[PDB]
Amino acid sequence: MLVDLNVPWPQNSYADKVTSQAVNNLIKTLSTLHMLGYTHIAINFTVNHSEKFPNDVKLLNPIDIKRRFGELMDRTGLKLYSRITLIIDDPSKGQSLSKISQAFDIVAALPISEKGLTLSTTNLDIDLLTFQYGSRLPTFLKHKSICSCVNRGVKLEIVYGYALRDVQARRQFVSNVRSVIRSSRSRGIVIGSGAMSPLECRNILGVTSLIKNLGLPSDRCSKAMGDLASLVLLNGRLRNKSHKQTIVTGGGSGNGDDVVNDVQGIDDVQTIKVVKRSMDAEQLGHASKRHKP
Amino acid sequence: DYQRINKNSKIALREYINNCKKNTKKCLKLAYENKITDKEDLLHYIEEKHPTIYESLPQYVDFVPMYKELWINYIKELLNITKNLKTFNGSLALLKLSMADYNGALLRVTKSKNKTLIGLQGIVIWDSQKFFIMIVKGNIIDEIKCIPKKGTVFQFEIPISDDDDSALRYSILGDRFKYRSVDRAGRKFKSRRCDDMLYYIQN
Amino acid sequence: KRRQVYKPVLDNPFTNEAHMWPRVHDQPLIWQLLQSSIINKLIHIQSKENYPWELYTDFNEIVQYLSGAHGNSDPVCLFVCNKDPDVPLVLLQQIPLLCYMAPMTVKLVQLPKSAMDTFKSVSKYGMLLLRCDDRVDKKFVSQIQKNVDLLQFPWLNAIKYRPTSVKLLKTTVPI
Amino acid sequence: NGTLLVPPPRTIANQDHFHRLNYLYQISAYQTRARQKARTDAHTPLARNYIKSMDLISKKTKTSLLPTIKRTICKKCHRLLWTPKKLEITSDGALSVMCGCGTVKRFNIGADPNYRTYSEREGNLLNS
RNA sequence: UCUUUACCGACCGUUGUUAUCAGAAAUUCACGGAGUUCGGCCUAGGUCGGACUCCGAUGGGAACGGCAACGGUUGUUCCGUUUGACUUGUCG
RNA sequence: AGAAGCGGAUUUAGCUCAGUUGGGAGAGCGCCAGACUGAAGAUCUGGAGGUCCUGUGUUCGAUCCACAGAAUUCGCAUUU
Ligand SMILES: [Mg+2]
Ligand SMILES: [Mg+2]
Ligand SMILES: [Zn+2]
């Protein structure tokens, strides 16, 4: 199973309206990621820290998984997650994080300065830390801080699609990624494709070679997409749908229903999951002694 | 004799759950001596030939209506589950389930690190700190079942009063909450590293 | 300054239904015979009070009689006054409870009249337990007990969930 | 004397706690009665456990109960007294109720009648 | 929290705290009932005082119990080093 | 991106920070709303907004007390 968790959405501000051409372009690149092969896609959305945020509930989501991606799902056979990368620069203006967190599934950050990077790892409940690979790194990471942040949770994220943008950006990208691998101790490394087009897509065996040539080993790369990628999905998925990893509204069937794998069988209206009477206390004993299922 | 047992309720509970397991092992031995596979004939066989052994045996047929109806009606009253379902509120319901006690619940091991623990349904007689106690029937087995919580996924059905139209199913994880009910009355559950949950993605 | 605060306190949700004293009606047809019989007992001799009619009027003897010492007399009848002042509530919350676990056919009758302070002020305490084995009195006691004075338990008989009851008490707080 | 304010907005957390306490009390009482009607004392250390946990939850959220509940349950081992050992009266004191464990709960009854508890008085209490 | 071959055991003292309500009482204040013993008036044994023991609905609660701080230990407190080798300078 | 080892200080709303017999969870700024103005700022009023770093245990009850696991950050005759 493969997870691509940083596909960007063609919108930066809530005042802007997405045209149908960008939506059709996203449909074509999802068909591209379905063509060669992938398992999970979590599309990303950029949010600045000092914007004028709407005080709404059902309007914080310009993603619409149900109406357009629910139609794409039946011909696709995959699933989409929605997430926010918090572009936090200065401790001047903030937000109500309990609404923005519980709106989508995964919560991320994007630091620019010193103190924001500390208060993100310290107090802010997020899932992944993304740095600006296109521009200059804010500070150079200390080992005992990043190690304690991985031991607390949140892992670092590398966007190999940002090197495919320009020529000059590749040097700054590799200079950031080698520092991330150096100061992260090769524990919290989750990789993702920041492509805006189907013309910049790659295969697993080329991304593995990219991670080889950057400095991280091969088995640890595939383990990062098998173990480390799908667990930080489950972290935010249990945090924002259910309680703080305590009691879940996700049905535990044999091999088809899961919190991660069965998204459509869960009513995404509030919490619930409508499941038929599969548990009878009257005449059901041990699992190996049953005869009706 | 009777006074020395019930001086501490925990030690007497431990003595009772040990006595139930010993009586179940003796019941299996007397059942293999009986050579009758039917349990309804086996209970009458024990009533005829072993009076003192029959006294500490559980009664699951009695245990189901005395627990399931009270548990379902308590959840239908507590979580405000009525005929009107379109006014539901899920977050406060999950907070109430975080505040409600699971003593007396029907619960099913759906996923576990051990492949043999899954498929077990049972009704809570007592909640431990890090283990779990249920009771399940087999062909002739009536053993008190202890199941670890570190690395297991549990699920329970909340039925609705309509017949075969709609019902709810919720899931808890015993590796997440690992405390007594007394602390769970006051505890506000917080975030964890959740790194050891790979089994839930694995199986 | 004093301020009044209402504090929520959990009630016993079934103590009202556990103390649903039985339905009694057309009761002045009974106190005439009962009071005349009790007075005719209490006139002559203290030995002749309990020698033709065996009755116990001390609660310790009521507990020792219903413990299981005497199992021969199965129909045993009890008369207890409620709605009456100067009656202790500690015994009265435990009298209909202890007769339920008794294996003998114990027939509690709740006397509903508030003005009936005579039987408490005269005999011992206001309660009467006696036996209808071969006495003449049963020849009318079996007549009316099926009519209105039936005593049955609905609360423990069937399986039923009980709704919670949370009341609230007054508290005067000085600051 | 002061200000008279009667609020009927009950709080949701207190309703959750008292529903939890009442559910534990009901399941312990029904286990005890279902065991006591049929046969001998099989799982009498079980239901007591619930009451003990109930009392510990009564220690957590600073909650108080009616004296009917605390009169029903014990004080040391915290068991239900629906089937007690012995009841004695006028044995040179007031009253005595013996239990199986040996802890007694006596009441001053030989002093005077017409004494009610603070929750049983005429106007001090409002239901629901 | 404690004890260690204890052929006898030994939870140190003081101060403050356990908020509101409840209850007679939140620290062996006091108050109410029962029993015993002693003394005075007095002698069908009535009453009064002192001492002990037991019980009294409430609350986690009456348990010299829990928490925090301080010491009588062989008087307390303060001050100084017992720590260097090469190079340079002064003095004999 | 200038380690290593040592002492001190410290983590509470988006931010900067109080605060604590141990029994209520806050102030300023910011956001929204009211008031006000032709409009706006300022002033003023109200509401929304909490993982009191996390965990154990003590207690009847933890921002507070004890322990454990993280760390934040200063200083080392410095402005690299
Ligand atoms: Mg080192
Ligand atoms: Mg070191
Ligand atoms: Zn007891």
All domains in chain A, ordered by first residue = 3-241 (3.20.20.140)
The amino acid sitting at A6 is N
The amino acid sitting at A133 is Y
Burial class (CB in 10 A: 0-12, 13-18, 19+), A3: buried
Asked if B71 and B149 touch (Cβ cutoff 8 Å), the reply is: no
Find residue B148's DSSP bridge partners.
B131
Asked if D126 and C6 touch (Cβ cutoff 8 Å), the reply is: yes
Nearest to A107 by CA among A130, A91, A79, A89: A130
D26 touching chain B per CB within 8 A: yes
DSSP result, chain B: -HHHHTTSHHHHHHHHHHHHHHHHHHHHHHHHHHT---HHHHHHHHHHH-HHHHTT---HHHHHHHHHHHHHHHHHHHTT--S--TT--HHHHHHHHHHS--TT-EEEEEEESSTTSTT-EEE-S-B-SSEEEEE---SS---EEEEE-TTEEEEEEEE-SSSSS-EEEEEEETTT--S-HHHHHH--------GGGTHHHH-
Look up residue D105 and give its two tokens: 């709960």
Look up residue B147 and give its two tokens: 């199941």
Asked if A15 and A51 touch (Cβ cutoff 8 Å), the reply is: no
Q: Is A128 helix (H, G, I), strand (E, B) or coil?
A: strand
Cβ within 8 Å of residue B94, ≥6 positions away = A242, A243, A246, A247, A249, A271
- CA B73 to chain CA centroid, nearest Å: 17
Asked if A110 and A86 touch (Cβ cutoff 8 Å), the reply is: yes
Round to whole Å and give the CA distance between B185 and A81: 34
Side-chain-side CA neighbours of residue D45 (13 Å): 19
**Residue B96 φ/ψ, nearest 5 degrees:** -65, -40
Look up residue D107 and give its two tokens: 């009441």
The amino acid sitting at A254 is G
Round to whole Å and give the CA distance between C133 and A269: 71
Cβ within 8 Å of residue C171, ≥6 positions away = C4, C5, C6, C7
Cβ within 8 Å of residue B186, ≥6 positions away = D60, D61
Cβ within 8 Å of residue B114, ≥6 positions away = B148, B151
First to last CA, chain C: 5
CA angle D56, D77, D64 (to 5 degrees): 40
Other CB atoms within 10 A of residue C24 CB: 17
Contact B173 A273 (CB under 8 A): no
Element (H, E) at D96: strand D95-98
Contact B120 A239 (CB under 8 A): no
- Looking up tokens 């029907």, which residue turns up? B106
- Of the candidates A231, A243, A251, the beta carbon closest to that of B155 is on A251
Round to whole Å and give the CA distance between A9 and B199: 32
The amino acid sitting at A40 is H
Does an interface of 3+ CB pairs under 8 Å exist between C and B? yes
**Residue B148 φ/ψ, nearest 5 degrees:** -70, 155
Asked if B140 and A246 touch (Cβ cutoff 8 Å), the reply is: no
The amino acid sitting at B84 is N
Chains interfacing with D (3 or more CB pairs < 8 Å): B, C
Round to whole Å and give the CA distance between B108 and C79: 52
Give the pairing type, strands B167-173 and A247-248. Answer: antiparallel
Interruption sites in chain D after residues (C→N beyond 2.5 Å): none
Task: Kindly determine whether the C-beta of residue A124 is less than 7 Å away from any atom of nucleic acid strand F.
Answer: yes
B24 to each of B12, B145, C117, D67, how far by Cα in Å? 18, 11, 59, 41
- CA C64 to chain CA centroid, nearest Å: 17
- H helix runs in A166-289, sequence order: 169-184, 204-214, 218-223, 229-240
Round to whole Å and give the CA distance between C95 and C89: 10
Nearest to D28 by CA among D64, D5, D55: D55
Asked if A188 and A155 touch (Cβ cutoff 8 Å), the reply is: yes
Cβ within 8 Å of residue A42, ≥6 positions away = A3, A4, A5, A6, A7, A80, A81, A82, A83, A105, A106, A233
Round to whole Å and give the CA distance between B114 and B199: 10
User: How many separate helices (H) and strands (E) can be counted in chain D?
Assistant: 3, 4
Give the pairing type, strands B121-123 and B167-173. Answer: unpaired
Q: Is D98 helix (H, G, I), strand (E, B) or coil?
A: strand
Asked if A20 and A64 touch (Cβ cutoff 8 Å), the reply is: no
Round to whole Å and give the CA distance between B46 and B60: 16
Annotated binding-site members of D for Zn(2+) = 74, 77, 99, 101
Look up residue C87 and give its two tokens: 């009656």
The amino acid sitting at A191 is I
Nearest to A4 by CA among A127, A115, A160, A118: A160
If you measure CA to CA, which chain D residue comes closest to B77? D19
Would you say the C-alpha torsion B173, B175, B181, B183 has a positive or negative sign?
Answer: negative
Round to whole Å and give the CA distance between A85 and C19: 64
Q: Is A80 helix (H, G, I), strand (E, B) or coil?
A: strand
The amino acid sitting at C61 is E
Round to whole Å and give the CA distance between C165 and D128: 6
Asked if A109 and A130 touch (Cβ cutoff 8 Å), the reply is: yes
Find residue A8's DSSP bridge partners.
A44
Look up residue A201 and give its two tokens: 């897509």
Quote the ligand 2 centre to A142 CA distance (angstroms): 16
- Site from A101, A107, A239, A247 to mutate, B interface, most B CB atoms within 10 angstroms: A247
Other CB atoms within 10 A of residue A253 CB: 17
Round to whole Å and give the CA distance between A250 and A269: 14
Task: Name the structure determination technique.
Answer: cryo-EM
Cβ within 8 Å of residue B149, ≥6 positions away = B130, B131, B132, B174, B175, B178
Give the pairing type, strands D2-3 and C2-10. Answer: parallel
Side-chain-side CA neighbours of residue A149 (13 Å): 28
| Resolution limit, Å | 3.5
A 188-207: CB within 7 Å of strand F: none
- CA D128 to chain CA centroid, nearest Å: 19
DSSP result, chain C: -EEEEEEEEE--TTHHHHT-PPP--SGGGTHHHHHHHHHHHHHS-HHHHHSSS-EE-SHHHHHHIIIII--S--EEEEEEE-S-SS--HHHHTTHHHHTTS-SSEEEEEEE--SS--HHHHHTSSSEEEEE-SS-STHHHHHHHTTTT-----STTTS-------EEEEEEEEE-
Task: Order the strands of the B121-123 sheet from edge to edge.
Answer: A247-248, B167-173, B152-159, B106-112, B121-123
Round to whole Å and give the CA distance between A191 and A224: 8
- CA B50 to chain CA centroid, nearest Å: 29
Look up residue C60 and give its two tokens: 């310790």
Round to whole Å and give the CA distance between A225 and B195: 14
